[PDB]
Ligand binder design. Structure first.
Ligand SMILES: O=C(O)Cc1coc2ccc(-c3cccc(F)c3)cc12
Ligand SMILES: O=C(O)Cc1coc2ccc(-c3cccc(F)c3)cc12
Lengths: 136, 136
């Protein structure tokens, strides 16, 4: 569907990388947080939902169902939380020393994941795909 | 054009709100930063450019032309920096006490600006407009 998203954790240099995937397109948004609190998760969902149609967020774990802020962010924004890739880390390792902060390398790797052509040569990007789907 | 953006400062509770406007659509993205450094500006541009087509960023002032990080972010991302609205603050004042941090109210106000129908009743939203333009 157009507004389906998958939310995930990944970890690096002892920080948490939050990743949202638009399932139909492959487009990603990521943010690095100091700590894995639900407060930070809730602000990232709020930003996401103001930038895109965010109807349903899937999570693999239980941590998102026990944060009152997240619950209140989803209600205000109209997000359905429901229970039930890592080329990213390859690219972060490529750029990691051409900028100091990990967060920057993450966002450089998000840039590349979203903009490249899905697989190399020919097709659309994750970022083209998401706009198309939503246009319809 | 599709990738034209306007970048602006606004201020509230003694913090800086960075605002990017997609000129053709009216869509906005905003971030609150501790300090007005170019480092923070450069990370916000990097995130923006990984989420959307960002070809040209207009600024009203000179502060962006004197930050080496911003200059290096634009070059890496392919952004042309060139030299040459505030319903936002109205909405931040409406929500400001239904959440603690200013940043949240900003993002709630961004959500509303982007999602509402441009003027009330009938039309498209800023957020629909931007996707349409880019689809084409
Ligand atoms: O490096 C850091 O941690 C500081 C920093 C904060 O926001 C940024 C956005 C972009 C770049 C950058 C620098 C050089 C080449 C390049 F392609 C990108 C750096 C930063
Ligand atoms: O409040 C704060 O500063 C903490 C906070 C950080 O990220 C957030 C994202 C969303 C909400 C929230 C809370 C209640 C109603 C609502 F519509 C939204 C709060 C926060």
């Amino acid at each position: 569907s157009p507004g389906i998203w998958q939310l995930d954790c990944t970890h690096l240099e002892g920080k948490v990388i939050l990743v949202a995937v638009h399932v139909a397109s492959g487009y990603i948004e990521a943010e690095v947080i100091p700590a894995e609190t639900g407060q930070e998760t809730a602000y990232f969902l709020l930003k996401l939902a103001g930038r895109w149609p965010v109807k349903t967020v899937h999570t693999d774990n239980g941590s998102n169902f026990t944060s009152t802020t997240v619950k209140a962010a989803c209600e205000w924004a109209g997000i359905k939380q429901e229970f039930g890739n890592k080329e990213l880390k390859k690219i972060i390792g490529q750029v990691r020393d051409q900028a100091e902060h990990l967060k920057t390398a993450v966002q450089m790797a998000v840039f590349i994941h979203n903009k490249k052509r899905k697989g190399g040569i020919g097709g659309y990007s994750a970022g083209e795909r998401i706009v198309d789907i939503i246009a319809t």
